[model samples]
Target: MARMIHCAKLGKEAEGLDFPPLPGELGKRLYESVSKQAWQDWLKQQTMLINENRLNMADPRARQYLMKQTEKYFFGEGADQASGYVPPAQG
Candidate 1:
């Protein structure tokens, strides 16, 4: 059977990722509770965040971004990004 998770973002149980989607506690939280579709959604937003680098923009953050909303609320130390994909300078 597929791994099961009580998807926190989706607000119900759904199929789980084969591995932790992230690295630390946040990753653990999502791994144990978030679904693959939701996380792929996160990937899409991560692309945007990296592209925009404007998490400060309170205007139009997305569904994928909203998933990790609290993480940016903390915005304390770090968040992951695509390897070697440096964000473009604000233009």
Candidate 2:
């Protein structure tokens, strides 16, 4: 059976990830504390952030922004939205 974990984001005990999701310390850190559902949620939000900003992974500046965003999403005060973002009225 998979191990259950105390989710850092959701503030509840939940299903843990089967394998480390990233590399190095980050992978180990999330595998240890973040829930499976929360990790998936982060991916969706991450994708949104990337799309809205049109961030180019090849650019160091964009990469730095994403790295900072990642820390804020999981561990910092909070994740930030791209400035001037507007949601679609209908989904």
Candidate 3:
């Protein structure tokens, strides 16, 4: 069975991740605090940010910007949608 934790973001108990997705201090903090569901949610939002901004991971500046966004998504202010993003209309 997977470990359970009180998710910091959701403020409720849920299934925890088996391991940290990141490295170094941030990974350690994520492992200690963030939950699996919250991490998955971040991945989806991060993908949108990368695609909308046409971010190149190879660029140091882009990577730095992404890191800042990741911190904000998890630990600080909540994640924001890409500028000028429009949601698809309901069927």
Candidate 4:
């Protein structure tokens, strides 16, 4: 059976993540507050942010920037999207 939580992002009860998705205090916060669905959404956004900005995770500065963005992406105003992005056409 899936564990349930009052997902902060969803503003209602929802299924929780299989495990803490991050580490340290931030992971604790996310485990308590975020839903699995919301985490998946953040992953898509984070990937876009990395690709659009040509970020290299090996760089300390790039990692730091992503950390800050992750905080905003979950616990605060959502992270900003890549500039001038357009959705691909759907059939």
User: When superposed on Cα atoms, how far off is each prediction in RMSD?
Assistant: 13.5, 8.3, 7.9, 7.5
Runs of candidate 2 with Cα error greater than 4 angstroms are 56-67, 78-91
Note the Cα lDDT for every prediction shown: 0.53, 0.62, 0.61, 0.61
TM-score of 4: 0.59
lDDT of 3 by residue, 9-90 (tens): 5666655675764545665556556566566666776678778888885765555556666677657776433223223333
**Candidate 3 Cα outliers beyond 4 Å, as residue runs:** 57-65, 78-91
1-91, model 1: which lDDT tens digit per residue? Answer: 2578854444556667757554456756656654654566657666676567655443445433554653653243434332222233332
Q: How accurate is candidate 4 locally (lDDT)?
A: 0.61
Model 3 residue 20 lDDT score: 64
Per-residue C-alpha lDDT of model 4 across residues 1-91, encoded as one tens digit per residue: 2567766655666667757655456766666665654666667766787887888857655555566676776576853332222233333
Q: Please provide the root mean square deviation of candidate 3 (C-alpha atoms, Å).
A: 7.9
Instruction: Give me the displacement of residue 53 in model 2, in angstroms.
Output: 3.0
Stretches of candidate 1 off by over 4 Å are: 54-91
- Candidate 3 TM-score, C-alpha based: 0.58
Worst 10 residues of 3 by lDDT: 80-89
Worst 10 residues of 4 by lDDT: 80-89
Candidate 4 residue runs with Cα over 4 Å from true position: 57-64, 77-91
lDDT: which candidate is best?
A: 2
- Taking all chains together, each candidate's TM-score versus the true structure is 0.51, 0.58, 0.58, 0.59
lDDT of 1: 0.53
